[PDB]
């Protein structure tokens, strides 16, 4: 068989809906295992300074006390069942989810009603975790990568909610209340802005009853968004006492529904990535990467493409020594302007064939599948099948890229960050003057 | 769709599973782990594991680096103390090209001089990326402490070996160990007769035991935190006795199934939660090679609180060996085991990791259903032995960090 025939053979997902407002969907597969999760609309984007960091503080007590399975009894029933449990939060989205087997699935859905709705939030654990948090804000000083993106979001989106961190300042964590969480819980966890999704060896109707069983008791009845602007600003936490300097730079992103995000994910992959381990070295394809391997300028860099509602962030993160920063940027901008103007068709086919293996290999199992589902069903509306992701890409050519990069790289007002011996780090003005070829 | 599984007269296995998926995927599991290294060729597989993407006869280093990224594939390399895998990825529309790139690495590598010399000092980098994650010299020292000759040899390369490695030294290694009798041309997202055609054209070509001794190593490194491990001589795979440990693993502690979970069901981490009033992290250690395995646990704590913690674990296991046990914890622990197996092979990669690993140790693939029945047929009188073999058995130990209050075995 062939590639295009394979995508049509995929299990096309199934969607449901309830009177309360809770979207539900799934995807059957031949996997005997399964997973389920709850992707929603909530994060630091909606907390104010008074309740900042709270949704992260929710993450640590939701599994540490309920009304019908108090204490570690909840934690116990999973380990008795043999499954895992995991969670995370973002600046817009938060997610609890399970990996388990097919037959024991009904026991799972019964819990998330006891978790989401009927959390108990014992004052002891409120105070214990209040120390656990302050333990981590010392730890994340070490997580230098996470330092940067925290700084970066805090600059371009300054003055807005989105500049907030996700875990929040120490101060608010030392002033937080049961009631602010009650209010926060009482507003964001609501059916019209929540999603359930699962994958594996199940059926969409085994599940539909459980939502009609448990989450049917949900409160199915709320502000909308302020357009979070973008800023071009520089930030720099000079620190010479360290080995190296994690660095980042980025610009305005378009956002989720804007279709040219397909194109940009290529260009990030046209430039690609490299970190001090790939034996290709000189032989590599990304001209940036080859030079970095040639002269050993940097040690690692990465690109990205964040998507938020009306905007995102396009940029990169790179990591080098204090005697090499200027040249990497000169080369780095040297690539963006190249694609704004002179983009070889064959080099496009490189990235078009990178991105296919990205989303597919990204989708190896069930948990990644439900990441996309629980995310797309809050951003794009529908799910997008993989045959549709392909058709969009096949329309692409170098004519498109020269329009897109000219729209979002060229001459814009970028956002910069730096934490380390940035003594060589040039000024934002010089950086912008290096932004436009000629 | 079902899983083909065959064998040629040359001892060369093939399998294939045309799932009609988009992402083709191939993995060539081989017996070339560093156990086959002698004293003089150490730190070799660490180089050979990076010797991919070098000159061949049918192609150059450059062309392969680009020919893959054009189709946008990969060339990843897993390597164990037993084995050495050449995993790849691509879309099914261009498998024929990437096939040719692979075999030229394994079948016609020249291993010239100058490309190696540039590639040697890379070892200093790769060696240190791991040891930012401090486990990977504690754990090597166990093998180097417990076992002697084969498995004692680390995956990675000692310092001094760098700048002293020879290409001829590889041709002896390659011609002796990339051999049609002890290989496994697994594939995926691909039909079976194709692979049957490839090997017959290109792969049409032709070490000691792990003597357990009982050893002990210590590393006062000045690091604020502690890392330690105490083990005993385990059993090799294939034996249902092996699964008796792998279920005991889940009885005792298997790591956090729950994010930020107190691991309350785990008999070990629960057992230290009393008396201690500070952080620590610990779980069971289970290893199971072909000649043998290893079993025990891996500790994390502060300096002063090393033996204060270990003397719960070394006691907790004795409680089990003295018969003190319940059945639901076992069936719970089984249900953990039955989960993690399927959850591991949920992914094609983790699936692939199991397919040929059996094809090398065994010459047969066991579907997961049959695996679960052997788990169903486990005896508590073997789970005990088990811990009795651990406690009654000879011991090996290693640790790192500060050691101002770390005791030895006999203490």
């Amino acid at each position: 068989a062939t590639y295009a025939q394979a995508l049509q053979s995929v299990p096309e997902t199934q969607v449901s809906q309830l009177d309360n407002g809770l979207r539900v969907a799934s995807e059957q597969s031949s996997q005997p295992t399964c997973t389920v999760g709850v992707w929603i609309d909530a994060g630091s984007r909606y907390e104010s300074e008074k309740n900042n960091g709270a949704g992260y503080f929710v993450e640590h007590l939701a599994f540490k006390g309920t009304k019908n399975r108090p204490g570690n009894a909840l934690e116990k029933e999973v380990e008795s069942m043999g499954a895992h449990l995991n969670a995370y939060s973002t600046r817009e989205h938060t997610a609890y989810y399970i990996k388990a087997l097919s037959k024991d699935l009904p026991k799972a859905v019964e819990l998330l009603a006891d978790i989401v709705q009927n959390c108990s939030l014992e004052d002891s654990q409120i105070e214990k975790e209040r120390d656990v948090i302050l333990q981590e804000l010392q730890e994340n000083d070490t997580s230098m990568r996470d330092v940067v993106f925290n700084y970066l979001h805090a600059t371009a989106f300054q003055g807005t909610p989105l500049a907030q961190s996700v875990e929040g300042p120490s101060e608010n964590v030392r002033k937080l209340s049961r009631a602010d969480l009650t209010e926060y819980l009482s507003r964001h966890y609501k059916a019209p802005r929540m999603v359930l999704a699962a994958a594996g060896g199940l059926e969409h109707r085994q599940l539909l009853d459980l939502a009609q069983k448990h989450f049917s008791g949900l409160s199915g009845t709320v502000p909308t968004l302020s357009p979070c602007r973008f800023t071009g600003s520089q930030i720099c936490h000079r620190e010479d006492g360290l080995p190296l300097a994690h660095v980042a730079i980025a610009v305005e992103g378009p956002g989720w529904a804007h279709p040219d995000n397909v194109a940009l994910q290529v260009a990030n992959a046209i430039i690609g990535h490299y970190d001090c381990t790939y034996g290709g070295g000189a032989h590599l394809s990304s001209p940036l990467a080859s030079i970095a391997a040639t002269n050993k300028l940097c040690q690692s860099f990465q690109t990205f493409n964040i998507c938020y509602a009306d905007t995102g962030l396009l940029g990169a993160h790179f990591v080098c020594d204090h005697m090499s920063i200027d040249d990497m940027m000169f080369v780095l901008q040297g690539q963006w302007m190249r694609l704004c103007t002179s983009a070889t068709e064959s080099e496009v086919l490189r990235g078009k064939n990178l991105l296919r293996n990205a989303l597919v290999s990204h989708l190896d199992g069930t948990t990644p599948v439900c990441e996309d589902i629980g995310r797309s069903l809050l951003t794009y509306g529908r799910r997008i099948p993989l045959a549709e992701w392909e058709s969009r890409i096949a329309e692409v050519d170098a004519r498109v890229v020269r329009e897109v990069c000219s729209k979002y790289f060229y001459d814009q007002c970028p956002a910069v960050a730096g934490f380390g011996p940035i003594e060589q780090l040039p000024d934002y003005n010089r950086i912008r003057s290096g932004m436009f070829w000629l | 769709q079902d899983l083909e599984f065959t064998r040629l007269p040359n001892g060369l296995v093939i399998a294939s599973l045309e799932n009609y998926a988009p992402a083709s995927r191939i993995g060539l599991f081989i017996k070339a782990g560093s156990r086959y290294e002698n004293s003089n060729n150490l730190g070799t597989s660490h180089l050979l594991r990076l010797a991919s993407s070098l000159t061949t006869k049918g192609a150059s280093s450059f062309k392969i680096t680009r020919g893959i990224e054009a189709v946008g594939g990969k060339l990843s390399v897993t390597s164990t103390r037993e084995n050495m895998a050449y995993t790849v990825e691509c879309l099914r529309d261009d498998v024929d090209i990437l096939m040719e790139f692979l075999l030229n690495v394994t079948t016609a590598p020249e291993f010239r001089r100058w490309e190696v010399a540039a590639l040697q000092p890379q070892l200093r980098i790769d060696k240190a990326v791991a040891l930012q994650n401090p486990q990977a010299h504690v754990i090597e020292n166990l093998h180097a402490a417990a076992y002697r000759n084969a498995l004692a040899n680390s995956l990675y390369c000692p310092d001094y070996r760098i700048g002293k490695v020879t290409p001829v030294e590889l041709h002896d290694y390659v011609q002796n160990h990339f051999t049609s009798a002890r290989m496994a041309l697994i594939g995926l997202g691909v039909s079976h007769p194709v692979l049957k055609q490839v090997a017959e054209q290109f792969l049409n070509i032709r070490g000691a035991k792990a003597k357990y001794h009982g050893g002990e190593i210590r590393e006062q490194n000045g690091d604020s935190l502690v890392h330690a491990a105490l083990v005993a001589e385990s059993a090799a795979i294939g034996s249902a006795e092996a699964n008796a440990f792998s279920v005991l693993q889940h009885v005792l502690g298997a790591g956090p199934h729950v994010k930020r979970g107190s691991n309350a069901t785990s008999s070990l981490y629960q057992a230290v939660a009393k008396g201690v009033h500070e952080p620590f992290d610990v779980s069971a250690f289970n290893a199971s090679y072909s000649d043998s395995g290893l079993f025990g646990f891996y500790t994390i704590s502060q300096a002063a609180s090393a033996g204060d913690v270990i003397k719960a674990a070394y006691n907790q296991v004795k409680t089990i060996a003295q018969g003190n046990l319940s059945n639901p914890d076992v069936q719970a622990a089984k249900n953990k085991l039955k989960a993690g197996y399927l959850m591991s092979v949920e992914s094609s990669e983790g699936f692939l990791d199991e397919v040929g690993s059996q094809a090398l140790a065994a010459g047969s693939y066991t579907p997961p259903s049959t695996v679960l029945q052997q788990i169903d047929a486990v005896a508590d009188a073997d789970v005990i032995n088990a811990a009795k073999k651990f406690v009654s058995g000879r011991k090996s130990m290693a640790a790192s960090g500060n050691l101002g209050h770390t005791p030895f075995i006999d203490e």
């Binding site: - | 993407s53 990969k74 790769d126 990326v129 994650n133 990977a136 754990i139 891996y298």
Partner: peptide, 16 residues
């Protein structure tokens, strides 16, 4: 844990 090495041409180096 049962440690395993992992390198590549494009997967970042890793330790299982």
């Amino acid at each position: 844990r049962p440690v395993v090495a992992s390198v590549s041409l494009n997967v970042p180096a890793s330790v299982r």
